[model samples]
Target: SSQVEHPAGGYKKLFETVEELSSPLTAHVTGRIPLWLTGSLLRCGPGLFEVGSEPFYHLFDGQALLHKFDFKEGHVTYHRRFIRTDAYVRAMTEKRIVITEFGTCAFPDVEVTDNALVNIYPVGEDYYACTETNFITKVNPETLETIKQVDLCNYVSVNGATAHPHIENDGTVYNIGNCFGIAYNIVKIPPLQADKEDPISKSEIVVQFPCSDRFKPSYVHSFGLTPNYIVFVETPVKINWGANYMDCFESNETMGVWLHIADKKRKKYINNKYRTSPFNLFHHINTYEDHEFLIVDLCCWKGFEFVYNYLYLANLRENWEEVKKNARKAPQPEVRRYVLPLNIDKADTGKNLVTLPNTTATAILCSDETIWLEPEVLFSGPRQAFEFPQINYQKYGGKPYTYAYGLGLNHFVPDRLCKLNVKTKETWVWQEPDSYPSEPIFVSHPDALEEDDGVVLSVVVSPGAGQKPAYLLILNAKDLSEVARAEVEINIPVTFHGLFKKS
Candidate 1:
C-alpha cells in the first residue's frame, strides 16, 4: 500500500548544488551552548553536484566541500570551502567532467577522482580529507583550506586504502588496502615522533592476505580493530579493475564471505576461518575479544548489486510517487553480532563452536574444514536501516562497550539520528518533520566516567520552502534528547562522515 504525497518537499534539495560561504558566519542559538564543548565539527561531502552543463550522475561524484562549525566558549561559527583537487580544477577549467567518479565517467581514459568527499581523518597532527582511493588531501582544519595532497602508494604497497583507520591510544594507526590485483595488504602508520619527518612517510605493510579470486578483490570500505587483533571481513561484492568504479562489478558471479584476523604483535595473518553466506556490508560497528572468541558487529544488506546499482541521482531527485515508479526498491539492512572462535581444534566437527554467554551466534565446524557462521540479529525490521555506525573510540572502541550511534535510514535516505544499546537492544531516536540528518558523531566528555556520557552532534538540513536552510543539532548521548541547536542561514547537502576536534 502506497501513501500520499510527503507533507514537505525538502528531500529534493539534497541533490541540488549550492554556493559556498568562504568566510565565517555566526549562527543563531536557540538554547544554551555547553561551555566545555569547545571545538570544531569538521565535515566533508558532495557539495557541487554539477560542473558546467554535465551533471554528476551519482551522489558520490559531486565536488568535495569541507564544512567547519567552530565552537568556542558558547558561540558557534560556520564556514565552508571546496577542496582544490585535480578532478574539480580540471572540470571547472574545461567546463566538463575530466575525472571519473564513483558512477559518472568522463571521456577518454581520465583518472579516478581525488575528490576526497567521503570522510575527514587524521594522519598525524594534521587532518586529511579522503575518499577510498590512494590519494588523500591534507587540509588546515581551522581555515578549511587545502594544504597538500599525499598518495599512500608513495610510502606503502597499496593501490587504495580505506577512509576508516583505527588509531590506538598511543597514536599508532592501522588500515587495509588492496595490492597489485592479487592480495590485500594491511598497512600500519607508526605513532608520531618528535622529529622532522612526517608519520605517513614511515608507514609500512604489516601483513598480506591473498585474494580468494586471483584477479578480483572484494570492495572494502571499513574494517574492525581490537587491542591485540585486527578483523577484516571480505564480502562477496567483487570489484573487477578491468573497468571504472561503477562498471567494476563482476556480474553473475558468486563468492563466499571470508573473515581474516591477525595478531598485531606477531604481524602475521592467521588463515581465514571457513566461509559464511554472502551479503553486502560497508561499516563495521565494533569488534572485540571475549574469553577466546572475537565478536564482530556489522551493518549488513542482503545480497549484492541492489544497493549500489539503484543509487543514481535521477532516481532520488524525484518525489515519492515518481521515485517508487521509476526505480527498483532498495534493500533493507540489519545490525548483526557475530562471534568467531579464536582457537579451533583440528578434530572439532559438526557442532557450534561459539561459547559466548548471551549471544546466540554460532560457528560450526564441518568435515570439509570450513566453519559455518550464524549471527545474532541485534536490530532488524521492515524499512529500517542503521548505517554509518560510530562509537566513542577514545574510551571504548576496541573494548566491550554498551552503546553505539548512527544515522537512521528510511528507504535508503537518512532521515533520523539513532542510538542503540548493544547489550539490551534498546533504541533511542531523534527526528524532525521534513528534516534529514547526517552521521551522528559522538564526542565524549573530557571528565567522563560512563560510556554514553557525552553529546552527539549532527548536521541537519531542511530544504522545504519558507524554512531556514540547515542547523547543527546537539543531542544528549544517553537519551537522544535535544540539548541545543545552532541554526545557520545556509543550505548544506547531506554528508557521509566527520569528527569533532577539541580546540
Candidate 2:
C-alpha cells in the first residue's frame, strides 16, 4: 500500500490525550485467551502530549500515561492513569509549566524534576517509571498511583542515568549513567530483600570509566548486557550542557563514537579505547559471550537520521516541502553483529587495526577466538527491519537466543509486529493493512523449552484512528499470528516501551 496524503491538521487526533480515568474497565475480547497465559501488560508513555492547548516540544517528553491490562482466570481488565508526579500535579493544578523542559513544552525554564514516562520496570520489589534525565518515579502498580521520586545521585555518584536498565534472573539490576562530565559508571542496584531495614543505602557503583575529555558525551538511551560485561557504544552525537538546554542537539563533536566494555566480575572497563567509524545507534537487541569474546547484535542508522526523523514528525511538519524532503531522507536502519575479543593487552597492541566498516564477517569472526570476520558480516547482510526489539525473558537474557520479537517499520513508522530468526534469516510478520502496532512484549510460557513459547502483547491503533484508536492485540510468540484482541474505550496516544509482570 502506498502512503496516504494528509492535510495540515492531519494527525492531531492521533497525538491528543485525554483526562485520566482511574476506573477499571472490562475490555471486550475478540478472540479466546490462551488458557496458560497469565500476566499483566504494563505500558508507559506520554498520553497527554499537550495540556490546555500547550504542546510538548518532543514526543518523548516524560509525562507518563500508564496503560495496564490484567489477566486472571482467562479473563482480562484494563486501566489507564497519568502518573501523579509532583511536577505533573503542580503543572496541572497551577495550569502552568514549572521545572526543566524536555525538548519543548509550555514554559522555557529547565529543572531536574522532569516527568518519568520513557520506560517502566521494577527497581527492587517496587516499580518505577524512568526518564533520560536520571529521575526514577516510583508508582503503585495495582492502583497506578505515584509514590515518590527517587534520585540515585543521592546514593551514588550518578548524575544522570539511562532510561533503560537490564535485570538478571537473580534480580541483579544494572544502570549506566554519567558520573559528572568527567566519567561514567555502571551502577548495581540489588534486589530489595524482605524486611531489609535500608535498601537504598545498599546501591553500589560497581564500575567506573573515564569519559572522553577530548569530546563531549552523547545521550545513551540503552546499552547491552552479557553474563560477564556491560556494553556501551557511544555515538558521535555530542551534548553541550553549558549552552541553553535545547542547544545540545546542535553540538556535534566528531563523526565517531567509542565502545566501552566493562567486566562484571573485574568491576572495571577492560576495553574502553576502541572507537568505531561514523554512525549512529540507539537500542541494542541483545548480547552474549561465545566464550572469552562478547557477541552483540544491534540496529544501526546512518548519522543522526533516526532522531531527526522523529523530531520532524513530532513537530507536525506543516511545511509541505520540508516534509517531502524529509521523506526522501528518511532514516534507513540496518542490523549488525559485532564480536570483540576481551584481552585488553592484546587488543590495544594490534596495528591500531580497527575493523574498518564495523561488521563481523563469517570465518573472520575470530581466530583462536580472536578471528576477524570480514566487514560484510559486520553489517548483517540483507536482514529485515527490526526495531524496539525484545527476546524471551530470563530464559535467554544473558545467554544466546535466536529470535527477536519487535515492531516492524515501513519508512520508520509502525506497520506491524514481527518475529525474526537471526540464525536462518527467516521472518514472520503480522501486518494489519489498516493498523499499526507499537512495541511488542514477549511473555514466556511457564514450562516451555522452545525459545518462542509464549505470547506477544502489543498496542494497536485502527486504520484511521492512529491517535483516537485503542486496542490491545495479543499474538502467538512463535509466529506473529493473532491469539486475541481487546478494545480499550479511551483516547490513548501512541506510546514507547512497556513491561510484563506475572500476577
TM, every model: 0.96, 0.87
Q: What TM-score does candidate 1 get on C-alpha atoms?
A: 0.96
Top model number, TM-score: 1
How much lDDT does candidate 2 score? 0.69
Off by over 4 Å in 2: 1-13, 105-110, 241-245, 251-255, 304-309, 312-325, 344-385, 463-468
lDDT of 1 by residue, 1-503 (tens): 01124435577777779788858999988888777899999998899998778888998889999999999869899999999888888887888888889888787524657999989988778898999999999999998888988888889999999989888888788898999748899989987798957999999998887788888888888988898888888888888733458787753246667888888788888874756866788999999989998889999886665377767888777776666554345555889998888888866788888877799999998888788899898888555688889999898988998899988876666788898899999888888878888999999988888999899999999776787889999998989999999998888887888889997
**lDDT per residue (tens digit) for residues 1-503 in model 2:** 11333333333444566677758788778899888777788888777665566666666654678878888877788888998876688778876655455665345434575577777888778888878765788888888888888878788888788877899887778888876645778888887787764455688888886666545666667888887888887776666532224556543446465667888888877743555554567778888877556677777765553354355335442443444445555445666676665643444443323332433333222223233322222223222247788889578986788888877654445557877776666777787555667899988888888999888999886636443356789999978788999887765666788799887
Model 1, residue pairs in steric clash: none
Residue 226 in candidate 1, Cα distance off native in Å: 0.4
Give lDDT: candidate 1, residue 334: 86
lDDT of 1: 0.84
